[PDB]
Amino acid sequence: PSWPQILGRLTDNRDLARGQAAWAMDQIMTGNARPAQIAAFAVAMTMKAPTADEVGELAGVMLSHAHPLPADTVPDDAVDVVGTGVNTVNLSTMAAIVVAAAGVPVVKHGNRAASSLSGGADTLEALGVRIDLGPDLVARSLAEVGIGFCFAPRFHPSYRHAAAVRREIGVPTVFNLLGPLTNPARPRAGLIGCAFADLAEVMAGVFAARRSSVLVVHGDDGLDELTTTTTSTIWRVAAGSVDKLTFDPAGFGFARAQLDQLAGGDAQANAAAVRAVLGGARGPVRDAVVLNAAGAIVAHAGLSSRAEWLPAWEEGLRRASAAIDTGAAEQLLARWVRFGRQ
Amino acid sequence: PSWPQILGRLTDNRDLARGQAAWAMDQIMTGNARPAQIAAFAVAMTMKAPTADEVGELAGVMLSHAHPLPADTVPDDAVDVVGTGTVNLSTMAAIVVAAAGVPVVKHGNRASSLSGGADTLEALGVRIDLGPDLVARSLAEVGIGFCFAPRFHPSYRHAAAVRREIGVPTVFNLLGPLTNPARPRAGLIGCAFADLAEVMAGVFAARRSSVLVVHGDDGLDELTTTTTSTIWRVAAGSVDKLTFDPAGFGFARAQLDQLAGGDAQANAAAVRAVLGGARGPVRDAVVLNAAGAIVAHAGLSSRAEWLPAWEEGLRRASAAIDTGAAEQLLARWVRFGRQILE
Numbered sequence: 001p002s003w004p005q006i007l008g009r010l011t012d013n014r015d016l017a018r019g020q021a022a023w024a025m026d027q028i029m030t031g032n033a034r035p036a037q038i039a040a041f042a043v044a045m046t047m048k049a050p051t052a053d054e055v056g057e058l059a060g061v062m063l064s065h066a067h068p069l070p071a072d073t074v075p076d077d078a079v080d081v082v083g084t085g086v087n088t089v090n091l092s093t094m095a096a097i098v099v100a101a102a103g104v105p106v107v108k109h110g111n112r113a114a115s116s117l118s119g120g121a122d123t124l125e126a127l128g129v130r131i132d133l134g135p136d137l138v139a140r141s142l143a144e145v146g147i148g149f150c151f152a153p154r155f156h157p158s159y160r161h162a163a164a165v166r167r168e169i170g171v172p173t174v175f176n177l178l179g180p181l182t183n184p185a186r187p188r189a190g191l192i193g194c195a196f197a198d199l200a201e202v203m204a205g206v207f208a209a210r211r212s213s214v215l216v217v218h219g220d221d222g223l224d225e226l227t228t229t230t231t232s233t234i235w236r237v238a239a240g241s242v243d244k245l246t247f248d249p250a251g252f253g254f255a256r257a258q259l260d261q262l263a264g265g266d267a268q269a270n271a272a273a274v275r276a277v278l279g280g281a282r283g284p285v286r287d288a289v290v291l292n293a294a295g296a297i298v299a300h301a302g303l304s305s306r307a308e309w310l311p312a313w314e315e316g317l318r319r320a321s322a323a324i325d326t327g328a329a330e331q332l333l334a335r336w337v338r339f340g341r342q
Numbered sequence: 343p344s345w346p347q348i349l350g351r352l353t354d355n356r357d358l359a360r361g362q363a364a365w366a367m368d369q370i371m372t373g374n375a376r377p378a379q380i381a382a383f384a385v386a387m388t389m390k391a392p393t394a395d396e397v398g399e400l401a402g403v404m405l406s407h408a409h410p411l412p413a414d415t416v417p418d419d420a421v422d423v424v425g426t427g428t429v430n431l432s433t434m435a436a437i438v439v440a441a442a443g444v445p446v447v448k449h450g451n452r453a454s455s456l457s458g459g460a461d462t463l464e465a466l467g468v469r470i471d472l473g474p475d476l477v478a479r480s481l482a483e484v485g486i487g488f489c490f491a492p493r494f495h496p497s498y499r500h501a502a503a504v505r506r507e508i509g510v511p512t513v514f515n516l517l518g519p520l521t522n523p524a525r526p527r528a529g530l531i532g533c534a535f536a537d538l539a540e541v542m543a544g545v546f547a548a549r550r551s552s553v554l555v556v557h558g559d560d561g562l563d564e565l566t567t568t569t570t571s572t573i574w575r576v577a578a579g580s581v582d583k584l585t586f587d588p589a590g591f592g593f594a595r596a597q598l599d600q601l602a603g604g605d606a607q608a609n610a611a612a613v614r615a616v617l618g619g620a621r622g623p624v625r626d627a628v629v630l631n632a633a634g635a636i637v638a639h640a641g642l643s644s645r646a647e648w649l650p651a652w653e654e655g656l657r658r659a660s661a662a663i664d665t666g667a668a669e670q671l672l673a674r675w676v677r678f679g680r681q682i683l684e
């Protein structure tokens with residue numbers, strides 16, 4: 001294999017041969033790829049339209065270079081809640097806290113962002129959470145708080161050349177999919193949002209080849225989370241298969257919201273919204289947080305429970321609303337801040 | 343304008359807004375574009391499918407940074423013999439064209455491709471790395487000049503390095519033929535990529551050039567007696583797509599193996615053989631490409647019938663060899679180069 005061979009196949013709009021994506025990713029992860037090569041590959045893979053097999057190789061090779069959490073410190077039923085990217089870091093941050101407050105272990109994965117729009121880590125820091133912890137400490141956090149956060153650069157140091165290139169070019173590429181696919185705690189369940197229906201289906205394919213119970217979701221308004229402004233598409237993944245469906249939260253009594261109402265802002269704006277919602281403020285933002293938290297709980301249930309789709313959603317919505325209303329979510333955040341200060 | 347804006351537009355498979363391609367090119371040419379940004383742009387433009395207006399902007403900006411030849415030193419009816427993407431044939435055809443009395447100014451880099459020939463010329467004793475003044479003097483005294491690409495386009499160095507690192511053909515392959523620093527108004531222009539060839543024809547049309555753009559129906563960027571060819575005949579600002587069959591002129595069909603290349607010294611030997619009157623498929627191919635350039639040259643001063651123009655072009659190319667004129671011109675060219683020292 002070589003760059004001219006792989007790049008040529010992509011620019012010819014052809015799927016790669018098995019092993020080629022992995023070769024490219026390993027070159028990237030080992031410092032052997034020139035920045036021009038990295039960028040050409042990222043762009044060509046994006047414009048060709050990546051397959052699940054290709055993205056599975058990229059993520060898999062990336063994971064092989066990552067630091068893991070210590071042996072047996074991640075509960076078998078840990079979940080992630082995240083979107084691939086305007087962003088909904090506000091929503092996924094709140095949902096994660098609500099989910100952990102409902103009693104489900106959560107482990108997230110993220111970085112500080114250059115943008116005025118908050119990355120995952122930025123909003124959490126604004127809330128007083130300590131985001132850059134080593135594997136042993138992330139593990140303690142999980143055991144004692146029921147939530148943990150893996151700071152991407154610490155857990156994926158060998159991804160530094162790819163990350164640099166991605167910032168240099170700015171444009172979204174297939175590499176934007178790797179974050180939720182490379183959570184170093186390797187949780188087996190989750191709610192994973194994607195802004196593009198076609199890439200969502202590709203990610204669901206990747207999760208299907210893993211031992212996973214996941215809802216990959218796409219708002220039909222383009223949101224990378226379950227939306228309340230219209231329907232969403234859900235790729236339900238369990239036991240190596242995928243069940244794709246149209247989902248409508250009006251069936252659970254959610255009023256229709258407007259897109260402008262749900263969008264995240266900078267870290268400080270987000271932190272303010274988090275305090276209002278966890279303190280009980282009603283509105284479109286709470287509704288979307290509850291909806292996505294419930295979705296993550298439904299995914300979690302798929303790991304063990306044999307509860308069917310509809311009663312799982314009903315219980316998921318009950319648990320998520322209750323985690324907010326009883327102050328459990330506000331208390332968990334405070335406990336999370338305490339853990340860091342100590 | 344910014345990279346995320348431009349690259350985002352291309353990955354969404356949209357044509358650029360006017361001036362966006364020019365902006366990207368000025369960044370590249372001024373040393374302000376990162377290798378990753380150059381590569382991303384090169385690949386994205388290629389996969390979107392470049393328009394004539396876009397390539398025109400790239401070429402126009404690149405030209406603006408090039409060293410020009412001194413004023414009034416390039417004959418109004420000069421032609422190029424050039425290509426992008428076997429024994430070198432461009433050097434021979436160019437020599438035969440000049441020997442037929444048509445001024446030739448070639449644009450080239452340091453094999454096989456019509457663009458090439460620099461190594462072959464060096465092997466024959468011709469001085470190829472000359473500044474603008476001496477290229478002009480060569481045109482006046484010998485009837486042919488060679489613009490060494492790196493010499494005339496120093497600011498393209500960042501782009502050139504990136505193209506080598508990625509090693510895949512891109513829209514940047516078109517720029518060579520479109521940025522001859524002497525700016526001849528006529529030419530025979532080869533293109534190995536049928537898609538890109540029509541685009542290149544469109545740019546020559548916009549410039550009001552008289553050009554034949556040729557694509558071997560076998561991926562050769564030059565005419566041969568192997569198969570039929572596609573020719574875009576460009577004149578009067580308009581483009582006509584034509585099939586071209588050498589057999590229709592009495593040429594026997596040859597095998598590509600008979601055009602096998604070798605080291606620069608092998609190409610030198612083939613040149614000497616052909617200019618000395620040796621018959622065979624190499625001569626036939628040289629005569630075809632030369633005649634093509636002569637037909638393009640005729641297009642500058644008159645609308646001419648396709649098959650008659652070709653017959654006369656073929657006869658003129660043949661006589662240039664058989665009179666000893668081509669062999670003599672090559673010797674005069676070498677002699678000129680040797681006079682420089684004194």
Ligand SMILES: O=C(O)c1ccccc1Nc1cccc(Nc2ccccc2C(=O)O)c1C(=O)O
Nearest residue numbers: 109110111152153156157159160163176179180
């Ligand atoms: O980039 C993403 O979309 C992303 C999303 C969620 C989690 C991680 C993500 N990316 C990364 C995943 C692992 C490492 C990342 N970055 C770095 C890696 C090594 C050294 C430095 C960095 C850095 O960005 O500072 C990065 C990154 O910033 O792009």
Ligand SMILES: O=C(O)c1ccccc1Nc1cccc(Nc2ccccc2C(=O)O)c1C(=O)O
Nearest residue numbers: 426450451457491492495496498499502515518
């Ligand atoms: O690359 C082509 O297809 C091409 C074809 C015909 C004429 C020129 C061509 N390219 C170039 C046109 C201008 C400059 C070129 N290269 C360089 C520019 C500055 C410094 C060094 C170089 C170099 O290639 O060494 C190059 C190049 O070799 O890629």
